[PDB]
Write an enzyme that holds these catalytic residues in place. Sequence first.
Site, mmCIF file in Angstrom:
data_model
loop_
_atom_site.group_PDB
_atom_site.id
_atom_site.type_symbol
_atom_site.label_atom_id
_atom_site.label_comp_id
_atom_site.label_asym_id
_atom_site.label_seq_id
_atom_site.Cartn_x
_atom_site.Cartn_y
_atom_site.Cartn_z
ATOM 1 N N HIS A 105 3.637 2.320 2.034
ATOM 2 C CA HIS A 105 2.967 2.331 3.332
ATOM 3 C C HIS A 105 3.432 1.172 4.212
ATOM 4 O O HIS A 105 3.405 1.309 5.446
ATOM 5 C CB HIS A 105 1.457 2.188 3.116
ATOM 6 N N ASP A 110 0.317 1.259 11.298
ATOM 7 C CA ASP A 110 -1.033 1.149 10.759
ATOM 8 C C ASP A 110 -1.981 0.960 11.956
ATOM 9 O O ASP A 110 -1.859 1.717 12.927
ATOM 10 C CB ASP A 110 -0.990 0.112 9.619
#
Lengths: 296, 296
Positions: free
Chosen positions: A270, A103
């Site tokens: 994610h 991320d």
Amino acid sequence: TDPLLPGFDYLTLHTSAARLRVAVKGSGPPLLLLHGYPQTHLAWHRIAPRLAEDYSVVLADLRGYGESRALDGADYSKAALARDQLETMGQLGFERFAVIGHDRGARVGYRLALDHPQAVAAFVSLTVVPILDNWAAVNKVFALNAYHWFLLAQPYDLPERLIGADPEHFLDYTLRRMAQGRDIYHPQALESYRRAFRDPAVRHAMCEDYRAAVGVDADADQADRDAGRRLQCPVQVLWEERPYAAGQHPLEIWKTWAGQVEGAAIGASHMLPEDAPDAVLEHLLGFLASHREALR
Amino acid sequence: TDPLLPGFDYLTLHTSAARLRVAVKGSGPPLLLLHGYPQTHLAWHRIAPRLAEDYSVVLADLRGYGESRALDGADYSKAALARDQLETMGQLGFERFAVIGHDRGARVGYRLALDHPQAVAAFVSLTVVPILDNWAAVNKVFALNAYHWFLLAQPYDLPERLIGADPEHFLDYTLRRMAQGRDIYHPQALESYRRAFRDPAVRHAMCEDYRAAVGVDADADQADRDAGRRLQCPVQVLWEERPYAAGQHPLEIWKTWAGQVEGAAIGASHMLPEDAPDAVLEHLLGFLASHREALR
Ligand SMILES: [Cl-]
Ligand SMILES: [Cl-]
């Protein structure tokens, strides 16, 4: 239940522009692991201990996140946070090292690799492609799914006011959404994420990250594209198993940014570090072993 | 200083699904004026009195905005608010009428014209094209400029929580942004907008509007496109003077939705009713006079 980060030595590093929370363990070639939003270095708790059995592992809170702070109108661009990483690793004795990011941390990582290719032996991105490619892909559904990319980038202090009114509500909602409702957050790691998000300075730093993503970070990516500059080291990308539109597959995108690219899909949310640590470890360990010469 | 809406008779209409705030004045062919976000019928205060010199003028608060409320999980789709308008005008004695809308009110208006062509004699859009066209145009800068289209559409109750913590801050910021900082808000009209926004039910209704825009409103537009259904009445579009990308000019877009289209650029902010009332009036009056036969 196992403890969190057994044997990790917690440090505070003082650099030119920041006071950085760092945790270290191990021996062998150096790896720097960089978390993302809205988290801290604890996101690596299911992965870092295994790595430290074979490598020197450095975990850091990104500037402004967690317990890391700018000394201060600080610069929260990826380029600035990349310099933090060079200084961090250098203080610990490493001039060249592998970088594994998730991320926002992967965004710091690739910018470090582009700006300072001599320093980055190998690079692993979990879920991330360069921001230039993300912006080219914006359409209705992108903007709905990733609404916060646009909210958090609004001028100071609009998003800070909105997310600051009930910080734990917003933090908890965001973590649940990012995890697709899966029960992946260790309750003690969660308290750390919550404490950080309750600090207005952390929330501000997160907005500055998102502002930079729109502006200077994208400009930096475009300049490298214009120059034909690519990452010089081996690259691995591990992506969430989901459909990708044509031109948007992470492996295809990374091959436009680097000559040596591999990767794999992982069947998780994610939040790969916490949701699929065993799968991530299998891939990481294989990659670092296959490029053992690159690490020398 | 002139008073606000001199001679307007304030009514509360009770319909099948709503309790609606309405203000009326005048004699002659009927005009229904529909405000937008985050406002009320008072947005028309610089335009409606002049119109009432020559027409029957009806001002309404949209369902959920201002003082209008759903009777109630109410439907806040444009189609539902269009039915409110049919019922409003019918109760006042008008089965066919001209519609002049700004912002969300123009969206109610064109959906009314498509769903109930027998009822709409003429249609004027201030700043608005159909939502289907807006969504096709989404890119990075769209989503940054119109971030709220994506925030306010997030699932219940995320945006309500964020905008509800300090409602007057968000309202005031939004009005200043929409006006490009121009001093266009009558201080008393402003207090009315503020009072409405301080009501959680109003804020919720506004989010439901934005949710509908993503979903059912866009689906309705696509069905009309698929069917080849167009607006049957003369159309005028008055747009903000700003650059439009190819395929995005409001006059070009409306010509794909209607066979009889005219319009003009106005050198003001998005808030045309309050920022450029004299320019708007000149164009409106000319349009209604040139289509006087259509109004019969
Ligand atoms: Cl990211
Ligand atoms: Cl609108």
